From a paper:
We show that CdbA is a tetrameric ribbon-helix-helix DNA binding protein and changes conformation upon c-di-GMP binding. Consistently, c-di-GMP and DNA binding are mutually exclusive. In vivo CdbA is essential, while CdbB is not, and depletion of CdbA causes defects in chromosome organization and segregation resulting in defects in cell division. CdbA is abundant and binds globally to the M. xanthus chromosome.
We obtained two crystal forms of full-length CdbA-His6. The first structure (traced residues 5–52) verified that CdbA is a RHH superfamily member, with crystallographic symmetry generating a classical RHH dimer. In CdbA, the exposed face of the β-strand projects residues K8, S10 and Y12, while L11 and F13 are facing the hydrophobic core of the dimer. The β-strand is terminated by P14, leading into α-helix1 (residues 16-28), followed by a loop and then α-helix2 (residues 32–48), with a strongly kinked region at A43/R44, and a C-terminal tail traceable to A52. The two α2 helices run antiparallel, with kink residues I42 and A43 packing against their counterparts in the opposing chain. Successful model building of the first form allowed us to solve the second form via molecular replacement. Upon solving this crystal form, we realized that a similar, but more loosely-packed, tetramer can be observed when considering the crystal symmetry of form one. The tetramer interface displays different hydrophobic packing between the two crystal forms we observed here, suggesting that it may have inherent plasticity that allows it to undergo this change.
Author numbering:
A (entry chain A), B (entry chain A): 5 to 52
Amino acid sequence: DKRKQSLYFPEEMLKEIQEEATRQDRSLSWVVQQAWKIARERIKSFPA
Amino acid sequence: DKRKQSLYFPEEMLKEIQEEATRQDRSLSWVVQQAWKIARERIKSFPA
């Protein structure tokens, strides 16, 4: 069940994401979702 | 240099991100940025 969310990126980073989106013929949202799925565990281990 | 971007997430996923943001006393944007920085390489290796 989908939900819209405005985020802030550095220029360089947004362009990096869009490059992967067009390379893979994907939405921005889908690439960022895959980044989360990959990183979740490593991030959930960050401290305080 | 910052830039605003609307993305779409599943409910569950947005809530997972916000949980890490408040746990770490961070913005949503900052957590998602860290997810990208972690996953970039693995994603840049995806195919077609």
